[PDB]
CSV table of C-alpha atoms and ligand atoms in Angstrom, one decimal:
chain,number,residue,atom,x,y,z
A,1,UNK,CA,14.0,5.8,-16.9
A,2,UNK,CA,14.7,5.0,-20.4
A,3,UNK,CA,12.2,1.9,-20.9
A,4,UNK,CA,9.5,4.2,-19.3
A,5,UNK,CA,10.1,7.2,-21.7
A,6,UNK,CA,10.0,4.7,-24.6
A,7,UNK,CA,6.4,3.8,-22.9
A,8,UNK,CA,5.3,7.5,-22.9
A,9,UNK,CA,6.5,7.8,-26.5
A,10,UNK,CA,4.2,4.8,-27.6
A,11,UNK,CA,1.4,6.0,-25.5
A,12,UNK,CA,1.8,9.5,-26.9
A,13,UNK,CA,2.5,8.4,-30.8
A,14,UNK,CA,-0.7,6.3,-30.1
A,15,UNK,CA,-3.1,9.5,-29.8
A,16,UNK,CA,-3.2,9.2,-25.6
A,17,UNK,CA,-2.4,12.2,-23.9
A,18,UNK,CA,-1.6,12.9,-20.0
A,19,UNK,CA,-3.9,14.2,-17.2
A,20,UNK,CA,-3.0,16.0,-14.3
A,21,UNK,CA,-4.1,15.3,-10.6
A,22,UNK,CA,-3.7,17.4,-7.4
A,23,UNK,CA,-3.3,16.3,-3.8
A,24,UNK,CA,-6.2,13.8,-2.4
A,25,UNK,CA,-7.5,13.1,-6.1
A,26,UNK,CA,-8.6,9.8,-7.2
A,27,UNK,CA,-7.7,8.4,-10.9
A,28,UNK,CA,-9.3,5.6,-10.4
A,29,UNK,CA,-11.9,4.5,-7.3
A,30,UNK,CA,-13.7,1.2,-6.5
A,31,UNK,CA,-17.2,1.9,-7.7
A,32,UNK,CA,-16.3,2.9,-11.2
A,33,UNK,CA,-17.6,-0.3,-13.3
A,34,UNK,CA,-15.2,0.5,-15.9
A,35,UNK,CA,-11.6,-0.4,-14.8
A,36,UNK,CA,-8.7,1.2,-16.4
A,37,UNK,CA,-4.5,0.8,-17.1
A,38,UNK,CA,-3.0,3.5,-15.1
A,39,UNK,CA,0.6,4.3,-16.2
A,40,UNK,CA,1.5,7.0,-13.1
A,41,UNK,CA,4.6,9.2,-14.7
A,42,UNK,CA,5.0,11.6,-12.2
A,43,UNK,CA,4.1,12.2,-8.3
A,44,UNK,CA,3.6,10.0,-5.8
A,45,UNK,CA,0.5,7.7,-4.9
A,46,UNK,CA,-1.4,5.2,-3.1
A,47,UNK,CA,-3.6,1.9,-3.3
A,48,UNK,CA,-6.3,2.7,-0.6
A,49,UNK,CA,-9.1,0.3,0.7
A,50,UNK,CA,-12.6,0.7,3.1
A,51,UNK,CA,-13.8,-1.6,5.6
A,52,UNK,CA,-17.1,-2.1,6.6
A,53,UNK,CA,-16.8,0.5,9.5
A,54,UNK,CA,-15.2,3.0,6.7
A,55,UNK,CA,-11.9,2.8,7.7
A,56,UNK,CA,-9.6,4.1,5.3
A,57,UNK,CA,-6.6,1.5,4.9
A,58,UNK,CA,-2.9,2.4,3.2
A,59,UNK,CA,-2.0,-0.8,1.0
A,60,UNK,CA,0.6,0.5,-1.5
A,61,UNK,CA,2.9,2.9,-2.7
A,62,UNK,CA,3.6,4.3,-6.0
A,63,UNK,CA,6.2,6.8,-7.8
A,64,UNK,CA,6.2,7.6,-11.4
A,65,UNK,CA,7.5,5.7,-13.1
A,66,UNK,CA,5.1,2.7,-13.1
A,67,UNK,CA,1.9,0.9,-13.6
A,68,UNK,CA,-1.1,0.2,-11.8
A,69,UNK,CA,-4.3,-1.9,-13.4
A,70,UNK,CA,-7.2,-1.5,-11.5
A,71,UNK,CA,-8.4,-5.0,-13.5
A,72,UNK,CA,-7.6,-8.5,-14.9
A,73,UNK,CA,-6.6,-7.5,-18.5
A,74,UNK,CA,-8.4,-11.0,-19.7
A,75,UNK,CA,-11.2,-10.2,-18.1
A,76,UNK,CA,-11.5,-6.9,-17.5
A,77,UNK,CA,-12.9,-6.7,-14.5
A,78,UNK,CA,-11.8,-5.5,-10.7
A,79,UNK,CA,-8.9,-7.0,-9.2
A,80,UNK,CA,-10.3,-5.2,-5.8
A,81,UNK,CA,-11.9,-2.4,-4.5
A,82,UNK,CA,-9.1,-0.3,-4.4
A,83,UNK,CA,-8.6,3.3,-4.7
A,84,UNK,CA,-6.1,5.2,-6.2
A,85,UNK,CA,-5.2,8.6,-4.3
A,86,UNK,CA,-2.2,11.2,-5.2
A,87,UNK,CA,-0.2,12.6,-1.9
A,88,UNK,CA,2.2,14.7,-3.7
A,89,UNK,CA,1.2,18.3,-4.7
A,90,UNK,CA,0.6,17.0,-8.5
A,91,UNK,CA,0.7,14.1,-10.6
A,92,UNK,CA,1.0,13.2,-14.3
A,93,UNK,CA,-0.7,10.4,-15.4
A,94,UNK,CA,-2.4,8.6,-18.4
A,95,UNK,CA,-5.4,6.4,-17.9
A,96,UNK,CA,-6.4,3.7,-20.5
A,97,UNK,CA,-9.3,1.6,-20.8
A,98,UNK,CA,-8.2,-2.1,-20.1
A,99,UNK,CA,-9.7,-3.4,-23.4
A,100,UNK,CA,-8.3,-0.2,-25.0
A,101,UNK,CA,-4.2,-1.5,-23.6
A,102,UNK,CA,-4.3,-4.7,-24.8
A,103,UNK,CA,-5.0,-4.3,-28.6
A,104,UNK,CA,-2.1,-1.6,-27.7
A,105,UNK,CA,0.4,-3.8,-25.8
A,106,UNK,CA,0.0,-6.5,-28.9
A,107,UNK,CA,1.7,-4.7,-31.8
A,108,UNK,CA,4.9,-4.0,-29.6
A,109,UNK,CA,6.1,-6.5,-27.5
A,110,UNK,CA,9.2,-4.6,-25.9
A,111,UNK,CA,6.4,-2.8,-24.3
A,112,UNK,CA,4.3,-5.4,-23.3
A,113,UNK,CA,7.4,-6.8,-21.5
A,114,UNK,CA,7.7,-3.6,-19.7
A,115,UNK,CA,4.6,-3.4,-18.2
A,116,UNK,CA,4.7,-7.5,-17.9
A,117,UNK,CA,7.9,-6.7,-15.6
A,118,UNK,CA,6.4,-3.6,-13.6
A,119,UNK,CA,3.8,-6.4,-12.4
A,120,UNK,CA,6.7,-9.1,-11.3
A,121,UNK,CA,8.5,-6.1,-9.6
A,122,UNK,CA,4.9,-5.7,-7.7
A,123,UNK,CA,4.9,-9.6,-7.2
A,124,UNK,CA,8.4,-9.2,-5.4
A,125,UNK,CA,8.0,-6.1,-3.0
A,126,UNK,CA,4.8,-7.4,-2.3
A,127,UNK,CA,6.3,-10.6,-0.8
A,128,UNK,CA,9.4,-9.3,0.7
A,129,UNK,CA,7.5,-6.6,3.0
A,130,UNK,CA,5.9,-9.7,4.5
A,131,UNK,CA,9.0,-11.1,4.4
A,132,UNK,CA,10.8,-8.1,6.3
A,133,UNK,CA,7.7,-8.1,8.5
A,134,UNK,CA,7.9,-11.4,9.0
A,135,UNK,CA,11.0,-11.2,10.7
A,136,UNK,CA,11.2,-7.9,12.3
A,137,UNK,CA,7.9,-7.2,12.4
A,138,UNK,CA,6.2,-3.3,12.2
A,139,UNK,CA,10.0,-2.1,13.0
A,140,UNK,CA,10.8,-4.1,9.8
A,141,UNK,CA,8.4,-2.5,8.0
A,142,UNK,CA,9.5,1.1,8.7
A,143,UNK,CA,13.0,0.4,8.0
A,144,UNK,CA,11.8,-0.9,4.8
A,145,UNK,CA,10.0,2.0,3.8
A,146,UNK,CA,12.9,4.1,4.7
A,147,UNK,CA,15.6,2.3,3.1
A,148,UNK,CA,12.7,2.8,-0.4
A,149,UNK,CA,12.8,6.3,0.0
A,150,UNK,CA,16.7,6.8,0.5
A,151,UNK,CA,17.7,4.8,-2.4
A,152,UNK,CA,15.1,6.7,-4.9
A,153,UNK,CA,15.6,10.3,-3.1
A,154,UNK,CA,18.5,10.0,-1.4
A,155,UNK,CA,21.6,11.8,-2.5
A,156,UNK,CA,24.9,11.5,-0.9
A,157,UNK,CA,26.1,14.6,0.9
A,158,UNK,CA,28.8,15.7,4.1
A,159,UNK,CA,25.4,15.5,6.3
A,160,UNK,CA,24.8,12.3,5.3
A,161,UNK,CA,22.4,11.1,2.4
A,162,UNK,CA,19.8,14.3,2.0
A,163,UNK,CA,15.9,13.3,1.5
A,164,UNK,CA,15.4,15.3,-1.4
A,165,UNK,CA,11.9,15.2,-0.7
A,166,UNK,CA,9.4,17.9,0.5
A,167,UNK,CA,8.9,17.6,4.2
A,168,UNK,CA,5.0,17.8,3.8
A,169,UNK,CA,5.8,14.5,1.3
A,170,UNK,CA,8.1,13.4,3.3
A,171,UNK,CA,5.9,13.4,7.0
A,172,UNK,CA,2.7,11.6,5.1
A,173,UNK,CA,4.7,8.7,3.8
A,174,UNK,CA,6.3,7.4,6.9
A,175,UNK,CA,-1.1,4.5,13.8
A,176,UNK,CA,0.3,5.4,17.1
A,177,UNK,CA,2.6,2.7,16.9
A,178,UNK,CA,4.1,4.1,13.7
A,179,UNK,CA,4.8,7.4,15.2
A,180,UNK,CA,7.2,6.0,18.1
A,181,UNK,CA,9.0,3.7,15.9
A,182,UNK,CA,10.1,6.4,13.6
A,183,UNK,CA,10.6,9.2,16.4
A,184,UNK,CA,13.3,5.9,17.8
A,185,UNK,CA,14.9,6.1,14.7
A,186,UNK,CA,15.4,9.8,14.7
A,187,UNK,CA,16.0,9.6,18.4
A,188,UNK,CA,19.2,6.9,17.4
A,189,UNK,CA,20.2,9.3,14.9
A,190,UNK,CA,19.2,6.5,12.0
A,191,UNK,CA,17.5,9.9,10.0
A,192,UNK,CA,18.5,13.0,11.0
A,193,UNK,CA,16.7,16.6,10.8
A,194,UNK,CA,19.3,19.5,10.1
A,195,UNK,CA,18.6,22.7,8.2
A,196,UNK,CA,14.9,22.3,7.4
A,197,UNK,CA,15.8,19.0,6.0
A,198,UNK,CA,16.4,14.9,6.9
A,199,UNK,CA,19.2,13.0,6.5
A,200,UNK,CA,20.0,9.4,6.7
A,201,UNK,CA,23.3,8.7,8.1
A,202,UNK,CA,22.9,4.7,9.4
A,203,UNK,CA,22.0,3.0,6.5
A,204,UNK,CA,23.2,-0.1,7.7
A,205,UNK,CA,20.6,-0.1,10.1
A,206,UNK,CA,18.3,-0.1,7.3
A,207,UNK,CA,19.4,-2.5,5.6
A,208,UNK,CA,19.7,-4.6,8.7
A,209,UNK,CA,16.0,-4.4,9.6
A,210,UNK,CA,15.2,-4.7,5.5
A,211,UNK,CA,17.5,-6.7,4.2
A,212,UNK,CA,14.8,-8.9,2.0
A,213,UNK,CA,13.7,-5.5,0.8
A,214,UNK,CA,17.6,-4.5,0.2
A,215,UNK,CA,17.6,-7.4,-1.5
A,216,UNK,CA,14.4,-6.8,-3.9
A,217,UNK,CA,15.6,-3.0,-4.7
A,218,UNK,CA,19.1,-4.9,-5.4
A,219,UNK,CA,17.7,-7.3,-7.7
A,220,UNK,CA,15.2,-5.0,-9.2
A,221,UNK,CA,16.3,-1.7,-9.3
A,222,UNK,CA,20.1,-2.5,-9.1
A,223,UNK,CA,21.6,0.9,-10.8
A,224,UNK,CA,19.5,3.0,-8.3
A,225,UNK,CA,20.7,0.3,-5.7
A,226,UNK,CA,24.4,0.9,-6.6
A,227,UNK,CA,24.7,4.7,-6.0
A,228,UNK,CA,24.8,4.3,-2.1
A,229,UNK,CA,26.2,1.0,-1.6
B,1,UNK,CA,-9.8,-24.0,-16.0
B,2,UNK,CA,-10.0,-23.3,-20.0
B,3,UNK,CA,-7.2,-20.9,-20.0
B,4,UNK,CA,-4.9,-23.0,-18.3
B,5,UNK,CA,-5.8,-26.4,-20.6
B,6,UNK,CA,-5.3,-24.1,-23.5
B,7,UNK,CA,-1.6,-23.1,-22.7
B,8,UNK,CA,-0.7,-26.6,-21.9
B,9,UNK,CA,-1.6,-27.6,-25.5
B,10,UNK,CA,0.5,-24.5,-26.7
B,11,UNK,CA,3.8,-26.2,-24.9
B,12,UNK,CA,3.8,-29.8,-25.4
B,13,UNK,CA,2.8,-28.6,-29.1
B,14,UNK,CA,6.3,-26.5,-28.9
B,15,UNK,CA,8.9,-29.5,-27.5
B,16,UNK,CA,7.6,-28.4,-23.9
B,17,UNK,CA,7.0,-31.9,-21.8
B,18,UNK,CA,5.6,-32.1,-18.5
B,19,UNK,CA,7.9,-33.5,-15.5
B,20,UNK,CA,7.2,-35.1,-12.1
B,21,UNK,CA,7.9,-33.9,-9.1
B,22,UNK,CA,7.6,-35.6,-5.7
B,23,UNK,CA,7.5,-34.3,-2.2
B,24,UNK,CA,10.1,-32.0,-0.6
B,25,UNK,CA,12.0,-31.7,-4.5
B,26,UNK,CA,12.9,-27.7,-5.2
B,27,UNK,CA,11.1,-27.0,-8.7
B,28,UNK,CA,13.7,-24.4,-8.8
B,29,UNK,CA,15.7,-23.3,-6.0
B,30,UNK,CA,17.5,-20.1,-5.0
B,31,UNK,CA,20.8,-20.8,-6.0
B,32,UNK,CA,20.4,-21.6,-9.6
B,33,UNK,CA,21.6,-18.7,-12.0
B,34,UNK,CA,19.3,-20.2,-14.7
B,35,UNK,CA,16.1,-18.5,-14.1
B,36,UNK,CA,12.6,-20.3,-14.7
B,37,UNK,CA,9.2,-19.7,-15.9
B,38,UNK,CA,7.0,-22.7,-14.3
B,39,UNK,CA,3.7,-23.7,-15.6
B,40,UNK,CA,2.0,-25.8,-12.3
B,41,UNK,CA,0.2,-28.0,-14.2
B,42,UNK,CA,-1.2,-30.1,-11.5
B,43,UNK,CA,0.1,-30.9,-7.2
B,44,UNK,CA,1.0,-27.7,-4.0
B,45,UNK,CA,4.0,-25.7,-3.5
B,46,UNK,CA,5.1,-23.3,-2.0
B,47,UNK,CA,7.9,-20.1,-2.0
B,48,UNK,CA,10.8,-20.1,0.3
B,49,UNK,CA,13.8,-18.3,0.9
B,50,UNK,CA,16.3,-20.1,3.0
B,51,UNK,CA,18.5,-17.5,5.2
B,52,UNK,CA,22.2,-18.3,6.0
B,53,UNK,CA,20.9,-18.9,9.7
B,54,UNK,CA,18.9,-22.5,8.0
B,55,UNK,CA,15.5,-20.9,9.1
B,56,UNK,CA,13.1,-21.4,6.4
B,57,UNK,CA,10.5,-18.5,5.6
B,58,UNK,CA,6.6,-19.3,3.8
B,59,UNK,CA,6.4,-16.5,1.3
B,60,UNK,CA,3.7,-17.9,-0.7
B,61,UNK,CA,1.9,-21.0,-1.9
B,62,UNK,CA,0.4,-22.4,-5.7
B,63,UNK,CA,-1.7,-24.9,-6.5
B,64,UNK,CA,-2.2,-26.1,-10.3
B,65,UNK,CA,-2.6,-24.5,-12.5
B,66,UNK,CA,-1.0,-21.5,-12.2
B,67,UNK,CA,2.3,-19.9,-13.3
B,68,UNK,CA,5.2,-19.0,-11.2
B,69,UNK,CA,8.4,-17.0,-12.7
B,70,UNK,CA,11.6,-17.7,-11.0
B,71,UNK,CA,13.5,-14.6,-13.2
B,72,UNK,CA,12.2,-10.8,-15.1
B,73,UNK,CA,10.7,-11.9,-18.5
B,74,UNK,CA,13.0,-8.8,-19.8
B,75,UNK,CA,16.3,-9.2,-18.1
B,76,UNK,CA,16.2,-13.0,-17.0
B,77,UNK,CA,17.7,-11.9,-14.0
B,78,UNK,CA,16.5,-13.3,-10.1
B,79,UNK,CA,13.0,-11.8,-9.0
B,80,UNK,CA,14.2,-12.9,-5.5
B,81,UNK,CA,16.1,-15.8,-4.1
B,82,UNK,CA,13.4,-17.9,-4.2
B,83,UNK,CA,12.9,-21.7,-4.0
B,84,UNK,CA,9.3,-23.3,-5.0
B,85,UNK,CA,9.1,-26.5,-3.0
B,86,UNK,CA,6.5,-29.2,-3.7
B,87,UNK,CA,4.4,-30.1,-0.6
B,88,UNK,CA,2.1,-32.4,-2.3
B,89,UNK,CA,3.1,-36.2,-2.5
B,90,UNK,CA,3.4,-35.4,-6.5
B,91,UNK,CA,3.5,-32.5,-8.6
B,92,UNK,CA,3.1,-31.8,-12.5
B,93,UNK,CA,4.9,-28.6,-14.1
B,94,UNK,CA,6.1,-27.8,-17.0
B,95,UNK,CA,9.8,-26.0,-16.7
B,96,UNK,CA,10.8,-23.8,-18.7
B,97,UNK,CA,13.4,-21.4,-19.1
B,98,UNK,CA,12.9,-17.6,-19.0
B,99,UNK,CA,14.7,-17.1,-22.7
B,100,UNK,CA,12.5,-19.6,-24.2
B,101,UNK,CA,9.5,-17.8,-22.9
B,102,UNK,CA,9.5,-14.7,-24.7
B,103,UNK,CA,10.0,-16.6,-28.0
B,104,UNK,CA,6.7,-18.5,-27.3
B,105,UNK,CA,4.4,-15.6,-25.8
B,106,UNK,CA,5.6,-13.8,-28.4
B,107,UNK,CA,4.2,-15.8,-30.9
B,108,UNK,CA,0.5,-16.3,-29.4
B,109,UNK,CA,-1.1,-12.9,-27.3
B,110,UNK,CA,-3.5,-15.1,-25.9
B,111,UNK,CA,-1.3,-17.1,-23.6
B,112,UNK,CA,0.9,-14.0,-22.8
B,113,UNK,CA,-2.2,-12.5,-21.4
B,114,UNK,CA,-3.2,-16.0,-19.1
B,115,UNK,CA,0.3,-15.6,-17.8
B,116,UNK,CA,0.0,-11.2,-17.4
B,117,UNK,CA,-3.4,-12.3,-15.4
B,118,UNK,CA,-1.6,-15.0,-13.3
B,119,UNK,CA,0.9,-12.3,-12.0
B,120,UNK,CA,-2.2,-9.9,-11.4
B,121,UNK,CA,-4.1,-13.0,-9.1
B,122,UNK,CA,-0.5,-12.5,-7.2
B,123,UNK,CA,-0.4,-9.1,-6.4
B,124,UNK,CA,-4.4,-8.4,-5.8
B,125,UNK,CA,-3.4,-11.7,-3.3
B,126,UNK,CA,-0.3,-10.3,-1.6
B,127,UNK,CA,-2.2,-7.0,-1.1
B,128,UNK,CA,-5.8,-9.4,0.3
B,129,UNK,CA,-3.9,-11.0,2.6
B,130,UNK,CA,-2.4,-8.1,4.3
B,131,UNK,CA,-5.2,-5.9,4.4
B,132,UNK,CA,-7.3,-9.1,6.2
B,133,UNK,CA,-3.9,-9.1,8.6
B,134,UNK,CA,-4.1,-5.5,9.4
B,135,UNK,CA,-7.9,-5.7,10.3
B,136,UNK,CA,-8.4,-8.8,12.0
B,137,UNK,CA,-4.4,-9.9,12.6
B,138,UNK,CA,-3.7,-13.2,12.8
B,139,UNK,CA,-6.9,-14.5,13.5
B,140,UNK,CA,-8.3,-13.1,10.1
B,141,UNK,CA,-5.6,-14.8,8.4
B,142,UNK,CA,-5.7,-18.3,9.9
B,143,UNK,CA,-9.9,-17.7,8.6
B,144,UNK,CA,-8.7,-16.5,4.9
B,145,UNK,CA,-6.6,-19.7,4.8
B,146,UNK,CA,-9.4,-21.8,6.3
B,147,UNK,CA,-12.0,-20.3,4.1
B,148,UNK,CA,-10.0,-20.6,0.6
B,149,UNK,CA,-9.1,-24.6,1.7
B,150,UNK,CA,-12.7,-24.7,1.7
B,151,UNK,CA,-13.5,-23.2,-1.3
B,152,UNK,CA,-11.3,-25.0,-3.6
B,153,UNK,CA,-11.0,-28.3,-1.6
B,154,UNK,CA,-14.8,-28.4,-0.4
B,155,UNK,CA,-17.0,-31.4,0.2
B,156,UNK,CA,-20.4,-31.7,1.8
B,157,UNK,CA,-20.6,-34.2,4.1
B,158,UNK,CA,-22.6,-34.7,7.5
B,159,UNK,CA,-19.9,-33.3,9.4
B,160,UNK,CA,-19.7,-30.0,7.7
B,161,UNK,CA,-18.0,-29.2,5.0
B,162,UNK,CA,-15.0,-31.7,4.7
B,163,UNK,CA,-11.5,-30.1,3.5
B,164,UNK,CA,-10.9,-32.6,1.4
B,165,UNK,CA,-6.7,-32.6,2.1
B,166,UNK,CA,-4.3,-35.6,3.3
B,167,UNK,CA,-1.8,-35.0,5.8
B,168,UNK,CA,-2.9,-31.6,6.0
B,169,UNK,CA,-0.5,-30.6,8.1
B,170,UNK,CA,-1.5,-28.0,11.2
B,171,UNK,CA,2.2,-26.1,10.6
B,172,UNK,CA,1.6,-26.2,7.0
B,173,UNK,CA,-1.6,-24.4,7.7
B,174,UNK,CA,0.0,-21.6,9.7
B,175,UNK,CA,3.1,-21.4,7.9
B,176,UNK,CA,0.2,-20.5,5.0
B,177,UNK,CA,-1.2,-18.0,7.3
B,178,UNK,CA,1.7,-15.7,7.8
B,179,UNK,CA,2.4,-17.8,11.1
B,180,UNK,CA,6.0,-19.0,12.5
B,181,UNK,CA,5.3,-20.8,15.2
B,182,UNK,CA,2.7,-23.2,16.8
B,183,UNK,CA,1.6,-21.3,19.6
B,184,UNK,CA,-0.1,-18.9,18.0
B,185,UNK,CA,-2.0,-20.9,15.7
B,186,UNK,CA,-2.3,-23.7,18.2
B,187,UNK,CA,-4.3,-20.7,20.3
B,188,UNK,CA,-6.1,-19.2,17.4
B,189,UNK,CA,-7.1,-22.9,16.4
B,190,UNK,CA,-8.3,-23.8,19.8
B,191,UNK,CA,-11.0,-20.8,20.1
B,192,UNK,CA,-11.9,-21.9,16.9
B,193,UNK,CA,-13.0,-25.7,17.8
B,194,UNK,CA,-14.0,-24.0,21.0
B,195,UNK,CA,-16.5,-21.8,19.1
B,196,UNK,CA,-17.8,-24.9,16.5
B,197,UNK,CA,-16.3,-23.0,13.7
B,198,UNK,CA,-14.3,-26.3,12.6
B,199,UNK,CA,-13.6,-30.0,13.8
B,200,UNK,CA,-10.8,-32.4,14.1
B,201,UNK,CA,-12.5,-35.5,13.2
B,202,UNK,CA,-10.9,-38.3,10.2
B,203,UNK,CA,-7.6,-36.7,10.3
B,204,UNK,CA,-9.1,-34.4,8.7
B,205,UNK,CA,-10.3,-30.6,8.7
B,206,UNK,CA,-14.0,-30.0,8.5
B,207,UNK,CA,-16.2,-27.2,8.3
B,208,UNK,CA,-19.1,-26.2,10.1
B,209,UNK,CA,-19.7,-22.4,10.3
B,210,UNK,CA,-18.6,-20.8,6.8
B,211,UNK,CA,-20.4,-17.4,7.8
B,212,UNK,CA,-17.6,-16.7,10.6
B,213,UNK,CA,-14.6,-17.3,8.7
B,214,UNK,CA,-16.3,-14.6,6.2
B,215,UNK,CA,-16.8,-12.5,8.8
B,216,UNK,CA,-12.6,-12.5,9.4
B,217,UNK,CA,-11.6,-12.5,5.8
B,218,UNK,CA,-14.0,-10.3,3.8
B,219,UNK,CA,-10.9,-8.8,1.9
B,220,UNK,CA,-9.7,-12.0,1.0
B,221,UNK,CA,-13.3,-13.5,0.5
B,222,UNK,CA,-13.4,-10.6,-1.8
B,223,UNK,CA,-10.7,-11.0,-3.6
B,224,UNK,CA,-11.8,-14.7,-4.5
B,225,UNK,CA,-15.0,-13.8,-5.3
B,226,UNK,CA,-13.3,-11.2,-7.8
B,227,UNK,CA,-10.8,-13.5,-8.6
B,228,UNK,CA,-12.3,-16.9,-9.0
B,229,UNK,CA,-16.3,-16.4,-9.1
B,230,UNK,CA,-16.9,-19.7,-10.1
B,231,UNK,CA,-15.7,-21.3,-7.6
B,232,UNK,CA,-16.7,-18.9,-5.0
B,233,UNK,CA,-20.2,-19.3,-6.1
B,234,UNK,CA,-20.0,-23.0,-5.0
B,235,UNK,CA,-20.5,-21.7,-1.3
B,236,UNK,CA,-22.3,-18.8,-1.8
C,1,LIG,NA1,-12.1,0.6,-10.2
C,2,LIG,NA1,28.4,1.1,-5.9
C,3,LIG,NA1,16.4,-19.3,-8.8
């Protein structure tokens, strides 16, 4: 993604260097007082919350390329206890102090509008999963989250578009409710396992069940959109 | 709101002229190729997307001020096919278009920050709303919507805390909620009369147990307490 290696660059130029993460570590947590501007490079995360019983709660995904702020960049404070938590095997990440970003997002504005953008693109997912959901409710949902992962890993082959995606990845990602919906799908041959690996081969369906969030990838990510449609 | 005063001074000193707006108009709608940034000076709306079908779907609602892009600052293309309707007899906005914008928070940080935190308020609320949804469901919701009416729109009186709202509609306040239909919310609603939590009295929503709807909607009571302090401290 060119406008996020121009981002790295700047970061780099700029005297910040990357951190690695392994699986089930935190970059940033809700009882750190000081929040931070996360730009996740590589691997695969998620926004995680606690309720009063301690209930862990899955909130939001995130691949590298992208941005996460764990605060208000006027203020500098929370935005919500949230945790961040890496579920692939590593991660590449910088962290920046809030006040730190912003004295750095002024004397470039190209990258200001980046990261200004990565938080619109959050706006919009954010409001066409309820949308989806909405709709078709919790089936919604998972076709959603499938129709994500096939147009970011999904590469067209004879058994249909391939996961490219480690299966230990790949089963995390996708309650007991959850577990039948996407069994129905693989029962209905939606998603196939072949060979030690999955395959999508009705992505109409998908886009049936998700079509706000078909829409959203088509309006945000419309290159990426284009290779299967 | 300081902020907010402070980047309506920085358009109306740049040609930038506020505009009326009555009930039921479309500040923007979703078939418009021109792309907006709006500045809600002052009145309610709310986001729609209209399907082919004619159903009509609640995404979101704004009250002034706040800021609502129609468009990607960078490409000036369609975040979504969006239309922000006004449900308040008038509305004040400033409309402006997405081109124009970069030329103006270019020039001053300190506005291009109030609009960077408005989009932050948006996600943090997104995200509060459904994790109060996948705890408590429905009911939690129909609480988060109760409780932030009565945050921003409270008024002691002798018969609670008065939500201070005309024609407050009851589908309005669902369709807020995540809601479709009546039933639901007329069944949620009722157990909530039932259990003195609020009153139908002056046509008019009041407010008599705060403690129960935060009980429902800690996520989203903590996400205005984080969020908007001030006013959360008025009724805590
Ligand atoms: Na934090
Ligand atoms: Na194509
Ligand atoms: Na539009």
């Amino acid at each position: 993604n060119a406008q996020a290696e121009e981002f790295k660059k700047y970061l780099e130029t700029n005297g910040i260097k990357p951190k690695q993460f392994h699986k089930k570590e935190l970059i940033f947590n809700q009882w750190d007082p000081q929040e931070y501007c996360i730009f996740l490079y590589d691997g695969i995360t998620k926004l995680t919350s606690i309720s009063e019983n301690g209930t862990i709660m899955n909130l939001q995904y995130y691949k590298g390329a992208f941005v996460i702020m764990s605060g208000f960049i006027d203020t500098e404070t929370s935005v919500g206890y949230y945790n961040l938590e890496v579920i692939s095997e590593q991660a590449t990440a910088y962290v920046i102090k809030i006040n730190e970003l912003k004295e750095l997002l002024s004397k470039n504005l190209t990258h200001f509008f980046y990261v200004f953008q990565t938080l619109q693109k959050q706006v919009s997912y954010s409001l066409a999963k309820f949308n989806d959901f909405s709709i078709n409710g919790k089936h919604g949902s998972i076709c959603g989250q499938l129709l994500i992962l096939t147009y970011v890993y999904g590469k067209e082959t004879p058994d249909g578009i391939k996961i490219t995606l480690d299966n230990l990845t790949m089963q995390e990602l996708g309650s007991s409710a959850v577990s039948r919906i996407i069994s129905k799908l693989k029962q209905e041959k939606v998603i196939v396992y072949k060979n030690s690996c999955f395959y999508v081969q009705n992505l109409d369906y998908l886009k049936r069940y998700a079509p706000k969030l078909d829409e959203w990838f088509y309006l945000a990510c419309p290159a990426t959109w284009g290779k299967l449609n």
